[PDB]
From a paper:
The active sites of serine proteases and SBLs share the same key structural features required for the catalytic mechanism. β-Lactamases are enzymes that hydrolyze the most important class of antibiotics, the β-lactams, enabling pathogens to acquire resistance by expression of these proteins. Mix-and-diffuse serial crystallography was applied to determine time-resolved distinct structures and structural intermediates of the class A SBL CTX-M-14 from K. pneumoniae during boric acid ester formation with the active site serine using the TapeDrive system. CTX-M-14 has a crucial anion-binding site close to the active site residues that is occupied by the carboxylate of β-lactam substrates. The asymmetric unit of CTX-M-14 crystals contains one monomer with the active site region solvent accessible.
As a reference, the TapeDrive was also used to collect serial data of the native CTX-M-14 crystals. In the native enzyme, this site is occupied by a tetrahedral anion, such as a phosphate (PDB code 4ua640) or a sulfate (PDB code 7q0z13), as in the structures we refined. The rotationally disordered sulfate occupies two slightly displaced alternative positions in the native enzyme (SO4-A and SO4-B, S to S distance of 0.4 Å). The alternative sulfates (A/B) are coordinated via hydrogen bonds with the side chains of Ser70 (3.1 Å/3.4 Å), Thr235 (3.1 Å/3.3 Å) and Ser237 (3.4 Å/2.8 Å) as well as the main chain nitrogen of Ser237 (3.1 Å/3.2 Å). SO4-B forms additional hydrogen bonds with side chains of Ser130 (2.9 Å) and Lys234 (3.2 Å). The obtained refined time-resolved crystal structures provided insight into the molecular kinetics of the binding of boric acid. Starting from the native CTX-M-14 structure, the above-mentioned sulfate and some water molecules (notably OW174, OW352, OW353 and the catalytic OW10) are present in the active site well-defined in the electron density maps. Initially, in the native enzyme, the alternative positioned sulfate ions refined to occupancies of 47% and 44% for SO4-A and SO4-B, respectively.
Author numbering: 27 to 57, 59 to 238, 240 to 289
Write the structure that this text describes.
Amino acid sequence: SAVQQKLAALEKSSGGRLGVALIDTADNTQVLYRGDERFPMCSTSKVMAAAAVLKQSETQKQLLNQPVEIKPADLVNYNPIAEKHVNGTMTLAELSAAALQYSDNTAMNKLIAQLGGPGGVTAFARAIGDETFRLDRTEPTLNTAIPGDPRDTTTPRAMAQTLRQLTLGHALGETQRAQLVTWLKGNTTGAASIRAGLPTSWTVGDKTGSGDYGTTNDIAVIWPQGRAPLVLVTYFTQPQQNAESRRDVLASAARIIAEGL
């Protein structure tokens, strides 16, 4: 297709490896570029941790209000929200919001702990039919993004399908799905990524991720005005361990996909 030629040209111009999956919910059509290759998830994995806690709250109705202590020893490398609450508590709701909307790594580690470790996050993925996602490490080491390392990876196709199920499908209860959507729509880290390649009038909920090897990711649900929503996953990684982030590549991929509809 024209879109795949343009995405391949974009990739060639970028020097890295680009993975894209689009699901158009109007007809369930899919556009894939390197759709079945593994990419490091980096912070995009926080969506799965938050959703797993939301799933627990379907049975434990008050779980999201449970206070969780933030101690100095809990702080890792990037904790914009948790740092404001050291020697205090945050609820699981506040930690989920922080992990999603500010990419707080301490918050992610608390969500992982609540689930019984990375294996508990992976288990949730398996329970909703995602056989590809794997979370192996906690923050910050899950972002090493080493070429060829399968730890902490997924594929674009799998993540697009999973994100669709979590936000537009019924993998979560109705209250929980709405909460997840609200959290994603309120993300603060995404202005230069998928959002930057889309009409300003469209509503986007997204989760970015970045890591070593210049890994630059974004996963989004998109509500165009007057049209069925879309799910778009854009993963990008580079050959040099110290490469700089390339959010512009994600914006450009989003622009190419949007042109094709």
